[PDB]
Amino acid sequence: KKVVLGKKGDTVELTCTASQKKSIQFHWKNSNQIKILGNQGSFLTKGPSKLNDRADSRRSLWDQGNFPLIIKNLKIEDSDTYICEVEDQKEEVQLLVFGLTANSDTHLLQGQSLTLTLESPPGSSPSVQCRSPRGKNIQGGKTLSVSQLELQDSGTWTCTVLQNQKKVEFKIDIVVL
């Protein structure tokens, strides 16, 4: 089903269709139907949710019948199905947002090791395909590690994670000294 994905720090976009193209009543509501974002005529009811502080929408677009919904500064808890019920149907986006980091913080040495941590939201079976400036295709699941870390490994690492048909790129920054 139509998923979206995020990066624990990004935004995201979620779509709502309408045939009258007219700004008719839509509401954005998560799985068990709290109110999150809703067209009340010519107005937006910031629903009573976890997202009383974040969510939004491009407002102009409504008079076109395309009603969006964004989740700014995604943290893994904003990961949940949503729903849009413009006139007689209830389009459901599904947002499974995560993020990732490495263990090493500021200090590394040549021949040492580093590991990974991907902060998935519950119910996810992803696969982490991760890269290196040296072509170290670290092939495996969550916890990616290598026993060889060298001065040639400098430069960030394009890490990626497949969660149900998509991925999103990642830094793994490498600095020495």
Partner: peptide, 10 residues
């Protein structure tokens, strides 16, 4: 009892 056929938890 349901609605839209795009992603379909509903």
């Amino acid at each position: 009892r349901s609605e839209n056929l795009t992603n379909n938890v509903k």
